[PDB]
CSV table of C-alpha atoms in Angstrom, one decimal:
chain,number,residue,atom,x,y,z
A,285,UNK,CA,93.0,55.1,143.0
A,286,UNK,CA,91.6,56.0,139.9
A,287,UNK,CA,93.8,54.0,137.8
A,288,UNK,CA,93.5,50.9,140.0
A,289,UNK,CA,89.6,51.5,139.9
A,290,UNK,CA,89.7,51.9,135.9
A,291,UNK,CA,91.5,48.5,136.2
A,292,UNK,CA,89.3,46.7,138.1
A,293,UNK,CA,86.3,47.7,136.2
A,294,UNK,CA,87.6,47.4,132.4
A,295,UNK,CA,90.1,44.4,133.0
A,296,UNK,CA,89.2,42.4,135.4
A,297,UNK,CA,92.4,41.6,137.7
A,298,UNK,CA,94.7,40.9,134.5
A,299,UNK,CA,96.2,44.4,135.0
A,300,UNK,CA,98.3,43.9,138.2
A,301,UNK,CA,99.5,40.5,136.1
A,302,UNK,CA,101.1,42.3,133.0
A,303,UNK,CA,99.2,44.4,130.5
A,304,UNK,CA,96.0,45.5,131.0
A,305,UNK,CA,93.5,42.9,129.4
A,306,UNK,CA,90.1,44.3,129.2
A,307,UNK,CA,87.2,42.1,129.4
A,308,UNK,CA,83.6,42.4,130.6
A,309,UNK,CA,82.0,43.6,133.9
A,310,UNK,CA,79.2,40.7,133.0
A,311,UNK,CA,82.1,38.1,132.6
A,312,UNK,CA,84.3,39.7,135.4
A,313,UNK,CA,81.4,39.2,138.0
A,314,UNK,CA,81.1,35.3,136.3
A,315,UNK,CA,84.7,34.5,136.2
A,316,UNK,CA,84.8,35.8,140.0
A,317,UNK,CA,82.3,33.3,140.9
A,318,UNK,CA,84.2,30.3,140.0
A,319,UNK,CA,87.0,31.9,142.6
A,320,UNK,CA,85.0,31.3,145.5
A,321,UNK,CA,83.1,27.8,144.2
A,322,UNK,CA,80.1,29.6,142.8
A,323,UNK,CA,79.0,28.7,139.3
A,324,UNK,CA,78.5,31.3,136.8
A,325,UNK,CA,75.2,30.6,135.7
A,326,UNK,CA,73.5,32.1,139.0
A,327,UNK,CA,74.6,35.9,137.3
A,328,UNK,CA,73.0,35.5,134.3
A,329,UNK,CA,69.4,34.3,135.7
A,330,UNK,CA,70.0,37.3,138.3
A,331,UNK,CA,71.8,40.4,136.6
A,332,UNK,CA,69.1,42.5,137.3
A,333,UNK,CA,68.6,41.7,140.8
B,146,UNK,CA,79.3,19.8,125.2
B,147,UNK,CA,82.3,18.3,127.3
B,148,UNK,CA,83.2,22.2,127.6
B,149,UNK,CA,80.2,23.5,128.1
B,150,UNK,CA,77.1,23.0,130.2
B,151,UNK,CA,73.2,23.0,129.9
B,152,UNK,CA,71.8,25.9,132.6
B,153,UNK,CA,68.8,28.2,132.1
B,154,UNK,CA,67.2,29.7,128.6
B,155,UNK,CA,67.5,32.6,126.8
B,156,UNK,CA,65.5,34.8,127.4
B,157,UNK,CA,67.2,36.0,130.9
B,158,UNK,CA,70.8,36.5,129.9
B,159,UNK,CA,72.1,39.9,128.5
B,160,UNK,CA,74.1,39.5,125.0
B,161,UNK,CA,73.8,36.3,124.7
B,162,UNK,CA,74.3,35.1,120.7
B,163,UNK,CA,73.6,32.2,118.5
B,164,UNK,CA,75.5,29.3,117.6
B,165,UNK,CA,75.2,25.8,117.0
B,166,UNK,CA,77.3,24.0,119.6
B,167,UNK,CA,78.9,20.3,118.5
B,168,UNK,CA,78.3,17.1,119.9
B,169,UNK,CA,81.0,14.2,120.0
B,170,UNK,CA,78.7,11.8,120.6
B,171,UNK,CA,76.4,13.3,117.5
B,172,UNK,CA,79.1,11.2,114.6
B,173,UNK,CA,78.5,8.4,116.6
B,174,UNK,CA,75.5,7.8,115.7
B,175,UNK,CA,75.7,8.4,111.6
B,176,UNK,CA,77.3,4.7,112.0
């Protein structure tokens, strides 16, 4: 579970999809958004809430 | 600006940098 975790936190979901791709938890949680029809910009006025 | 969209400022979001983003319709009016 530790491996899966590391993947889901430093690459996103591209590691069950090939190599693991890292990207940020800032963009994962923005690029997540867009999969269930919100728009990204509602993290970035609320990343500290 | 046909790829990317107006929302918010800049002093709220975390890492964000500086660049100058192009306008298609910006040649248009040098004519």
């Amino acid at each position: 579970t530790s491996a899966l975790l590391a993947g889901t936190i430093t690459s996103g979901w591209t590691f069950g999809a090939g190599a693991a791709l890292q990207i940020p938890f800032a963009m994962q949680m923005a690029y997540r958004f867009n999969g269930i029809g919100v728009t990204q910009n509602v993290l970035y006025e609320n990343q500290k809430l | 600006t046909d790829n990317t969209f107006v929302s918010g400022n800049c002093d709220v979001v975390i890492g964000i940098v500086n660049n100058t983003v192009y306008d298609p319709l910006q040649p248009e009016l040098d004519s």
